[PDB]
């Protein structure tokens, strides 16, 4: 007639990327990044076109977009109301990921090179963490973007004040505090393609604070690292077999050598050894045909092989490898495999982090550093209390300490004034207070709309 | 897209019923249909009608000619000498397909008059006025007329529409398909002291000019099918719901307080089903009618539900609250997704049954807890795998035979066996749970809300089905709405578990490689059994090692056998630290039984029941004991109880005893540990040290501290130690000694539990606890040592059985003067007398059970007595008792009792096809063939039960015991 | 195939920014004739012509990395492109020290760690080529001279 399931003893207490992103399609997720492309990682230069309308030198008219944006938004609302009115999934094509439609915001990063960073086509959510005031509270200050959640336990290193709403980017890669600023009055956004220039205005720009990593970047040549390498190659080989039109399905080796040119061909052969065979003569000659007994994996199995966040962690590792290699142990500590391991270990409670150090991406007192630290009388007798109490009121010591009239305490205090066991609680308290202070300082520096002199 | 199989579209139907005569069991009425022809040259119009005498038919007030023929009255000819069942199944499928309104066909063929052909070619309206009469209906609509004198309201006489699926043809002529939606106008002229309950909202109630009768006018503006239209006419006590005011509850007279207490929960069921879906309840009223001699325990129509009165309990009745509560809940789930959103074909029925069962399981999860949800899901999955390995398999969504491994045709609902229908609904809701596992629960509720929102925008238009077919769901439309809301399509999961009809069998065994620190699993499938299929997807496995609980996904391709997964450290055995569990907590474990070299404590293959599977894993006995003790999953505790019966070591006895002593364990795990402890105790006789099992534990938990053999006075307010207290002597009575005689220490304990029972102090009744005490007394009966077939007299009465017989005589006689609830003690005492007769104690005489199986008794007493008579005619090979049972199948007033007799005679058959019996005449073959052909022609559930009985007794070929 | 779109930020003088903003929010194709962009073959120099009035432009590198994020429901945001360049209108000169937002000013100088920073490779390659071209090479680490 009741619950009768002892649930408190058995059980004591989401991000959907675009279909180009979960299928690891090669413009958005590159197979190989060279040295000059690893130095320009997430900073892609403005390339000159060889063919197209912008390839011809001269003045080029920009095309302001207003009819395209509202036509696409009205069309997507018609699609959503035709499908029952609920929430829909729209990003199914690469042409859905253009900047020419939808409500764009901008997101600026505080650090130069973050430990993790999203590729093009990946999704993120905006969560507004709101700690209620003690007792009565009016309700979360409402915000234009994101959903609100009431956080008793602070997600970040510091703890939220009562009545403080903090927005944050939340995805599988990291979680980072964001701060909404209005755009400058002079800046517009020009989307250039091969055909022409297009212009939008922007009104909302977020500043993203120091990231709290939720995914561990592997080290160079680590087991996980090289496992992702051979998995990325296997997924690319399977998707080339799916794209093949001949029956039985056949691929060419130098397509894979064009995609992965740093790979030795022994490793590519190793991936093709199972699931394919080389025909040297007759029909299908110089092709790697698919074995007739081999069942090519379905789309969901290929998606379950490699995740996009693993590709972002691998790209962070190889970009940091390049930056360290170019710059000839302090720098090695600031490498994202070390800092991600340190932060995730600190979140399980394995170890603590020195919040002031050299892994600090600011280079000043603002921001944290994610590197691991371990969790860990002859003349004072003549006074004989009577005269020590008189010495305390002559030393301007407050009357409480004089009042307790203790022996050891009063003398320890008068030795301290004449100068003027455990290691677990005090150290933990100091680390927590330092982290909270750093978080508060970072928020104050970030949300400031005060003008800063050049 | 829905295109009609009928060449006309029905817009509106008026059903008027006059002259409901209860003495003569007769109704008179008319029916006026408003059809729009879609094809010119319509000529004949084919409607559905059974048992109605059609007087006249006028089309547009012009007299028309009709011809009636029902091929399902006598399926095969009387003078055909065929006696095999495949012939009857094909002929019965062809006969049901010849009256099918889902094709163009129908039983009543009306010819359009000639002068209306210029009205039908340019497609204009036709108004068909049939007037009919039911003279004395067999199974059309049930007349319950008691034999007390007085007026018909003073004796308690009532009518209700019974049947399943498309059975509205049995009481008025209609287009009896779920795809012909129309609006309705329903008038019923009943007696002045009676009330007529039906679908729609009651617009008025006018008197007749003599003021002796009154007419109830109902109107249904939401377009429903004819199959969802119902009727209940009787002297009902009306009760408006004090929480929701459009909901009226009708009961039989003198049962108003039971109705008040029983239907007081229903507003919470309404609130749940309207907050997980975001649509409000689509109909403008809701009516719950409680009746006598019901067809099914719960039937759901449009804006109406018909329950039996046997669900009505008072405030002091426990063990019946949860069952009645979930009957109300599944009636409301079928109100949402069987009556508002209807079916497009007979295929796509799995969609509606799955959505109904799935949202009812979500209700059960919120109401009774996740643990009760997991236990229910596991019992449904065990039910399906038992049925599919027993006979063939259940095929959701067949394509039109698609399933030729069974003995009936799955093209129509009225040819299905009843066990197949039950397993169909069961498999449909488990496959919907699988679709929720692939595509998350919030997207699933968004799918259901999109279907309901399309239906409710469709439900308000007036266009005659330009838009009313958005209220009909199909499989392709359901998968398209899933693909719209999620972007993933489930076509491999649909192809495996819907279109393919099989379950999978997993045989697992592990080996721990100490050198490389890996766990080598070995999972092989039995795919050559008749019910099985081959699984090639991914498979989750959960390994509990000393460092915690880790999940692994295994890819089980056809050629796969060995799966090497990695193992973690064993540094929580170096220091004593707590071992972290599946949830966030951690416990102290006694690691003395564990191996020194392996860190892993237990392994579970497919823990979340994400496939339709039967797992046979080979762990070590200490791993089963650790999984019984420290797991935070009830299905794993249940499967460890089930696997500890093969290991009778004293460590397993200690494990089950620690489970039994432990509150904060789920109570249905302790109730299983009682029976497991009884089996283990029976297997380690001549090793057992102290008292019998669970006795000291019973005296520690439920008896007085100062008196060990006196039980505490009954206080049943905890509801978990009540269930454990009433289940522990029932398992304790299975204690088997070396001599095979129950220990007179346990029988004396049960008799002292019976004597010292005092129930004058709790707020709850004692009928189920006393009934379980009689069941415990019946469990202790071992077979008697008859010498030279000595006639069972008082001279050879066992000294043990005389006490048992005195107690059940006292209990049955006291039930004759003071009854309980459900006549539980009558049912338990009849069951115990049959237990004593099955052994050589009481003379094998069926006259007592034949007197309790008469018509005037309660239906639980009747089915218990008929179960005893079926068991007697199986053991004693009685010819006259089998003729008694077949006669009772042919002419009994209650059709539920006839269905139950056929069901019990199928489950416990008097002979199988392998047996040579004296009861295998040509006379019995001719009787059962006449019962399949004629005789059961009025119910559609007795005919499938007769087909099941003929299959169980004589098989699919020609009866062998024949010239 | 698909080519990732290349978005950059255009900064205009404030009066010209107001005219361009009014013409963008109006939405006619009249703006298309009024606003043109000519990028010189230097790659870091241009003209932006507002209402046929030429303005001198420089394409500069921004110290932080921005990312355009589109949305349909304002709860889930999909990354569309990376922005690192700005065509301000009025080498070391083509590097912008400040960030676009108000809190990020003098970011490169103050809020950027110098460990991450520090052309060198190109100079090393040129030296290697000269050494390969030469017959005899003489080297000494030197002192003050």
Alpha-carbon B513 to chain mean position: 47
CA distance, residue B685 to nearest chain A CA (Å): 34
Cβ proximity of B733 and B748 under 8 Å: no
Residue B514 CB neighbour total at 10 angstroms: 11
Among left, alpha and beta (phi > 0; psi -120 to 50; other), residue B880 is alpha
* C-alpha torsion B250→B253→B254→B260, nearest 10: 0
The answer to whether C6 contacts A193, with C-beta atoms less than 8 Å apart, is yes
The tokens 């006393």 sit on which residue?
B770
Residues of B in contact with A88 (CB under 8 A): 484-485
Measured CA to CA, the distance from residue B779 to residue B743 in angstroms comes to 12
Helix B859-875 × helix B879-890 angle, to 10°:
140
In sequence order, what are the beta bridge partners of A422? none
Interface test mutation site (partner B, options A1, A7, A10, A299, max chain B beta carbons within 10 A): A10
List, as ranges, residues 72-101 from A with C-beta within 8 Å of B: 83-89, 92
DSSP B818: S
- Contact assessment for residue A5 and residue B370, using Cβ atoms and an 8 Å cutoff: yes
Residues 418-457 in B contacting A (C-alpha not used; CB under 8 Å): 446, 449-451, 453-454
CA distance A297 to B492: 12
Kind and range of the H or E run holding B747: helix B744-755
- The beta-carbon neighbor of A86 closest among B450, B584, B666 is B450
Q: What are the chain C neighbours of A452 within 8 Å (beta carbons)?
A: 102-103, 105-106
Q: Are A142 and A335 in contact (CB under 8 A)?
A: no
* Interface mutation vs chain A, best among C22, C111, C118, most A CBs within 10 Å: C111
- Residue C78 has its nearest CB partner, among A64, A91, A201, at A91
- Find chain A residues with C-beta within 8 A of B664's C-beta: 6, 8-9
Which of B486, B488, B666 lies closest to A6 in CB terms?
Answer: B666
- Report the gap between the CA of A364 and the closest CA in chain C (Å): 7
Residue of A nearest to C63 (CA): A112
Q: Out of B371, B585, B663, whose CB is closest to A5? A: B371
Cβ within 8 Å of residue B935, ≥6 positions away: B890, B946
Q: Of the candidates C3, C11, C120, which has its C-beta nearest A186's C-beta?
A: C11
Inter-axis angle of helices B85-98 and B942-954, nearest 10? 160
First to last CA, chain B: 54
Q: Hey, of A186, A316, A336, A338, which one would you mutate to test binding to chain C, going by the most C CBs within 10 A of its CB?
A: A186
Interface subset of C 56-75, CB within 8 angstroms of A: 59, 61, 63-75
**Most A CBs within 10 Å, among C12, C74, C101, C109, to test the A interface:** C101
- Contact call for residues B637 and B631 (beta carbons, < 8 A): yes
The nearest CA of chain C is from the CA of A394 a distance in Å of 49
The C-alpha of B662 sits at a distance from chain A's nearest C-alpha, in angstroms, of 11
Q: Tell which of B489, B539, B585 to mutate to test the A interface (max A CBs under 10 Å).
A: B585
d(CA A97, CA A106): 15
Whether B12 contacts B468, CB under 8 Å: no
Task: Decide: B329 and B358 in contact? Cβ < 8 Å.
Answer: no
Nearest alpha-carbon partner for B546 in B507, B602, B502, B501: B602
- Residue B241: φ, ψ to 5°: -65, 125
Of C20, C32, C66, the CB nearest to A63: C32
List of chains touching C (3+ CB pairs within 8 A): A
The angle at the Cα of B450, spanning B447 to B455, to the nearest 5 degrees, equals: 130
d(CA C145, CA C13): 51
Of the candidates B322, B487, B492, the beta carbon closest to that of A298 is on B492
Q: How do B237-240 and B231-234 pair as beta strands?
A: unpaired
- Closest by Cα among C1, C23, C8 to C88: C8
CA distance B901 to B418: 13
Residue C21 near chain A (CB below 8 Å): yes
Contact B332, B326 (CB under 8 A): no
Q: Are the Cβ atoms of A84 and B450 closer than 8 angstroms?
A: yes
Q: How many residues does chain A have?
A: 454
- Contact between A105 and A183 (Cβ < 8 Å): no
Resolution (A): 4.1
Looking at the complex, does the CB of residue C106 fall below 8 Å from at least one CB of chain A? yes
Shortest distance between the Cα of A452 and any Cα of chain B, in A, equals 47
Q: How far is A173 from A161, CA to CA, in rounded Å?
A: 26
Cβ contact, residue pair C4, A27, below 8 Å: yes
Assess A400–B contact: CB distance below 8 Å, yes or no: no
Which tokens hold the place of C42?
């230097």
Interchain CB contact of B762 with A (< 8 Å)? no
- Which secondary structure element, helix H or strand E, spans residue C86, and what is its range? strand C76-89
Chains B and C, touching by 3 or more CB pairs within 8 angstroms: no
C42 reaches A (C-beta below 8 A): no
By the CB < 8 Å criterion, does A110 face chain C?
A: yes
Q: Where are the alpha helices (DSSP H) in B839-941?
A: 847-852, 859-875, 879-890, 895-907, 922-933
DSSP state letters, B79-133: T-----HHHHHHHHHHHHHHS-TTTT--SEEEEPPGGGHHHHTTT--EEEEEEEE
Residues of chain C contacting A124 with CB distance shorter than 8 Å: 69, 76-79
Helices assigned H by DSSP within B441-592? 441-458, 475-486, 491-497
Does the N-terminal peptide bond of residue A248 adopt cis geometry, omega within 30 degrees of 0? yes
Q: Is A117–C65 a contact, with Cβ atoms under 8 angstroms apart?
A: yes
User: Which residues have CB under 8 Å from A227's CB, separation 6+?
Assistant: none
How far apart are alpha carbons A268 and A292 in whole angstroms?
A: 20
Give the CA dihedral A265, A271, A272, A273, nearest 10 degrees: 100
A181·C114 Cβ contact <8 A: no
Q: Please count the CA atoms within 13 angstroms of the CA of B33 that sit on its side-chain side.
A: 26
Q: Cβ atoms within 10 A of the Cβ of B245, count?
A: 9
* B403 Cβ neighbours under 8 A, 6+ residues apart: B392, B393, B395, B410, B501
**Inter-chain contact A11–B583, Cβ cutoff 8 Å?**
yes
Q: How many CB pairs under 8 A join A and B?
A: 82
Closest Cβ opposite residue A61 in set C26, C36, C78: C36
The CA distance from B962 to B81, in Å, is 11
Distance from the Cα of A198 to chain C's closest Cα (Å) equals 9
């Amino acid at each position: 007639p009741w619950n009768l399931s002892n649930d408190e003893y058995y059980y004591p207490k989401i991000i959907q990327h675009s279909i180009p992103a979960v299928e690891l399609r090669q413009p958005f997720f590159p197979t190989h990044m060279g040295p000059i492309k690893l130095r320009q990682f997430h900073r892609p230069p403005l390339k000159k076109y060889s063919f197209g309308a912008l390839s011809q030198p001269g003045p080029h008219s920009v095309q302001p977009l207003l009819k395209h944006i509202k036509k696409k938004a009205k069309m997507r609302e018609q699609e959503r109301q035709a499908s029952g009115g609920g929430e829909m999934f729209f990003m199914r094509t690469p042409q859905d990921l253009t900047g020419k439609d939808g409500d764009l915001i901008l997101a600026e990063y505080s650090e130069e090179n973050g430990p993790l960073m999203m590729q093009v086509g990946m999704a993120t959510k905006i969560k507004n963490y709101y700690k209620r005031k003690p007792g009565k509270d009016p309700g979360a200050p409402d915000c234009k973007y994101g959903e609100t959640v009431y956080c008793h336990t602070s997600p970040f290193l510091g703890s939220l004040h009562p009545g403080q709403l903090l927005q944050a980017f939340e995805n599988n890669l990291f979680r980072a505090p964001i701060y909404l600023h209005k755009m400058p009055e002079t800046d517009f956004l020009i989307i250039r393609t091969r055909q022409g220039y297009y212009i939008r205005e922007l009104v909302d720009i977020f500043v993203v604070g120091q990231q709290c990593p939720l995914f561990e970047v592997p080290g160079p040549n680590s087991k996980r690292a090289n496992t992702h390498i051979r998995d990325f190659l296997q997924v690319f080989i399977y998707r080339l077999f799916w794209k093949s039109k001949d029956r039985p399905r056949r691929i060419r080796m130098e397509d894979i050598k064009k995609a992965f040119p740093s790979h030795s061909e022994s490793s590519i052969r190793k991936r093709l050894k199972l699931c394919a065979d080389f025909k040297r003569t007759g029909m299908d000659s110089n092709w790697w045909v698919l074995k007739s007994d081999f069942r090519l994996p379905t789309e969901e199995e290929i998606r379950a092989m490699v995740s996009p966040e693993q590709c972002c962690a691998y790209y962070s590792m190889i970009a940091a490898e390049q930056r360290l290699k170019d710059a000839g142990d302090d720098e090695v500590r600031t490498a994202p495999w070390n800092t991600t391991r340190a932060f995730i270990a600190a979140m399980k409670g394995k170890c603590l982090l020195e919040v002031t150090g050299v892994a600090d991406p600011t280079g000043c007192g603002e921001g944290f550093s994610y590197v691991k630290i371990p969790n860990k009388d002859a003349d004072l007798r003549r006074l004989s209390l009577k005269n020590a109490k008189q010495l305390l009121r002559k030393f301007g010591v407050p009357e409480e300490e004089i009042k307790k009239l203790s022996r050891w305490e009063v003398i320890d205090v008068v030795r301290t004034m004449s100068t003027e066991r455990f290691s677990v609680a005090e150290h933990q308290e100091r680390y927590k207070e330092e982290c909270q202070r750093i978080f508060d300082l970072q928020n104050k520096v970030l949300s400031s709309t005060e003008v800063l002199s050049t | 897209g829905f295109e009609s199989p009928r060449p006309y579209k029905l817009t509106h139907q008026v059903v008027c019923i006059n002259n409901i005569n209860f003495q003569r069991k007769s109704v008179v009425g008319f029916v006026e249909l408003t059809i729009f022809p879609t094809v010119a040259n319509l000529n004949r119009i084919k409607l559905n009608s059974k048992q109605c005498r059609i007087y006249r038919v006028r089309i547009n007030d012009l007299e028309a000619a009709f011809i009636y023929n029902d091929p399902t009255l006598e399926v095969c000819h009387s003078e055909s000498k065929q006696r095999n069942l495949n012939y009857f199944s094909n002929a019965y499928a062809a006969a049901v397909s010849a009256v099918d309104p889902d094709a163009g066909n129908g039983e009543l063929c009306i010819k359009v008059p000639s002068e209306l052909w210029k009205h039908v070619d340019e497609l204009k309206v036709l108004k068909i006025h049939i007037n009919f009469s039911l003279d004395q209906p067999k199974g059309g609509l049930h007349f319950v007329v008691p034999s007390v004198e007085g007026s018909m309201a003073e004796r308690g006489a009532h009518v209700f529409s019974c049947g399943y699926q498309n059975s509205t043809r049995f009481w008025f002529p209609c287009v009896d398909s779920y795809s012909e939606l129309c609006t309705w106008k329903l008038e019923f002229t009943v007696d002045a002291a009676m009330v007529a309950v039906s679908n729609g909202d009651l617009v008025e109630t006018v008197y007749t000019h003599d003021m002796r009768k009154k007419t109830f006018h109902y109107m249904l503006t939401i377009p429903t099918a004819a199959s969802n239209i119902s009727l209940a006419i009787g002297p009902f006590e009306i009760l408006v719901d004090p929480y929701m005011h459009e909901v009226t509850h009708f009961c039989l007279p003198q049962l108003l307080p039971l109705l008040k207490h029983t239907t007081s929960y229903l507003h919470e069921v309404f609130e749940f089903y309207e907050e997980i879906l975001t649509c409000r309840y689509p109909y403008s009223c809701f009516k719950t009618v409680f009746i006598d001699e019901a067809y099914v325990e719960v039937a759901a129509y449009a804006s109406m539900s018909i329950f039996s009165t046997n669900l009505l309990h008072s405030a002091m009745i426990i063990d019946e609250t949860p069952l009645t509560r979930r009957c109300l809940a599944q009636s409301l789930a079928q109100q949402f997704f069987g009556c508002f959103i209807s079916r497009m074909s007979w295929s796509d029925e799995w969609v509606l049954k799955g959505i109904s069962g799935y949202i009812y399981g979500l209700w059960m999860k919120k109401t009774f807890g996740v643990n009760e949800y997991r236990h229910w899901i596991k019992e449904e999955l065990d039910k399906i795998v038992a049925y599919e390995l027993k006979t063939g398999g259940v095929l959701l969504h067949p394509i039109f035979n698609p399933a030729s491994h069974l003995h009936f045709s799955i093209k129509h609902p009225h040819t299905l066996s009843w066990e197949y229908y039950s397993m169909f609904q069961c498999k449909a809701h488990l496959v919907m749970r699988l679709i929720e596992n692939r595509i998350s629960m919030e997207f699933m509720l968004q799918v259901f809300n999109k279907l309901l929102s399309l239906a409710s925008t469709a439900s308000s238009q007036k266009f005659q089905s330009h838009m009313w077919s958005q209220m009909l769901v199909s499989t392709s439309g359901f998968l398209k709405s899933i693909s719209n809301v999620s972007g993933k399509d489930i076509q491999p999961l649909i192809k495996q578990w819907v279109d393919q009809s099989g379950v999978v069998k997993f045989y697992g065994s592990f080996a721990f490689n100490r050198k490389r620190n890996v766990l080598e699993l070995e999972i092989k499938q039995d795919y050559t059994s008749p019910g099985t299929q081959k699984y090639v997807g991914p498979l989750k496995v959960t390994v509990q090692e000393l460092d915690g609980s880790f999940n692994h996904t295994l890819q089980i391709e056809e050629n796969s056998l060995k799966h090497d997964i990695p193992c973690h450290s064993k540094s929580r055995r170096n220091k004593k630290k707590k071992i972290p569990l599946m949830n966030g907590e951690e416990v102290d474990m006694d690691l003395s039984a564990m191996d020194a070299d392996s860190p892993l404590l237990w392994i579970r293959i497919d823990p979340d029941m994400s496939v339709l599977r039967k797992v046979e894993f080979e762990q070590a006995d200490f791993m089963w004991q650790y999984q019984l003790r420290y797991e935070r999953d009830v299905v794993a505790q249940q499967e460890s109880i089930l696997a500890l019966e093969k290991f009778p070591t004293p460590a397993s006895r200690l494990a089950l005893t620690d489970i039994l002593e432990q509150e904060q364990c789920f109570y249905r795990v302790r109730m299983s540990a009682c029976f497991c402890l009884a089996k283990i105790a029976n297997s380690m006789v001549s090793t057992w040290t102290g008292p019998p099992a669970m006795k000291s534990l019973f005296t520690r938990m439920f008896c007085c501290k100062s008196c060990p053999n006196i039980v505490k006075t009954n206080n049943f307010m905890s509801f978990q130690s009540y269930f454990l207290q009433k289940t522990m002597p029932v398992a304790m009575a299975l204690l088997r000694d070396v001599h095979n005689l129950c220990p007179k220490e346990v029988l004396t304990f049960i008799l002292d539990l019976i004597k010292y029972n005092d129930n004058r102090k709790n707020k709850f009744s004692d009928n189920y606890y006393r009934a379980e005490m009689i069941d415990a007394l019946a469990n202790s009966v071992t077979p008697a040592v008859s010498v030279n077939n000595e006639v069972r007299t008082l001279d050879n009465l066992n000294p043990d059985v005389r006490l048992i017989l005195e107690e059940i005589t006292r209990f049955l006689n006291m039930e004759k003067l003071l009854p309980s609830y459900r006549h539980t003690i009558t049912v338990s005492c009849l069951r115990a007398i049959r237990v004593l007769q099955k052994n050589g104690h009481v003379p094998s005489d069926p006259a007592l059970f034949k007197s309790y199986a008469e018509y005037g008794h309660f239906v639980d007493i009747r089915i218990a007595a008929l179960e005893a008579v079926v068991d007697y005619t199986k053991v004693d090979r009685s010819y006259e008792e089998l003729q008694w049972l077949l006669n009772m199948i042919q002419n009994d007033p209650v059709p539920y009792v006839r269905h139950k007799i056929l069901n019990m005679l199928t489950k416990n058959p008097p002979f199988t096809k392998n047996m040579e019996s004296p009861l295998c005449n040509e006379a019995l073959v001719d009787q059962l063939w006449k019962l399949m052909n004629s005789g059961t022609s009025h119910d559609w559930r007795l005919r499938c039960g007769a087909v099941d009985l003929y299959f169980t007794l004589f098989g699919l070929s020609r009866p062998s015991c024949l010239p | 195939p698909h080519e990732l779109e290349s978005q950059f930020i255009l900064r205009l003088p404030p009066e010209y920014a107001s005219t361009v903003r009014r013409a963008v929010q109006s939405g006619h194709v009249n703006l298309k004739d009024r606003l043109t962009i000519e990028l010189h073959p230097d790659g870091r120099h241009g003209i932006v012509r507002v209402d046929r009035v030429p303005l001198a432009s420089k394409l500069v590198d921004l110290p932080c990395v921005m990312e355009s994020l589109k949305t349909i429901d304002k709860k889930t945001f999909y990354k569309t492109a990376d922005i690192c360049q700005m065509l301000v209108s009025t080498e070391k000169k083509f590097i912008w020290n400040h960030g676009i937002t108000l809190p990020l000013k003098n970011v490169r100088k103050r809020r950027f760690r110098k460990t991450a920073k520090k052309d060198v490779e190109k100079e090393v390659k040129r030296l290697l080529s000269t050494d390969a071209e030469a017959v005899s090479t003489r080297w000494e680490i030197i002192a003050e001279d």
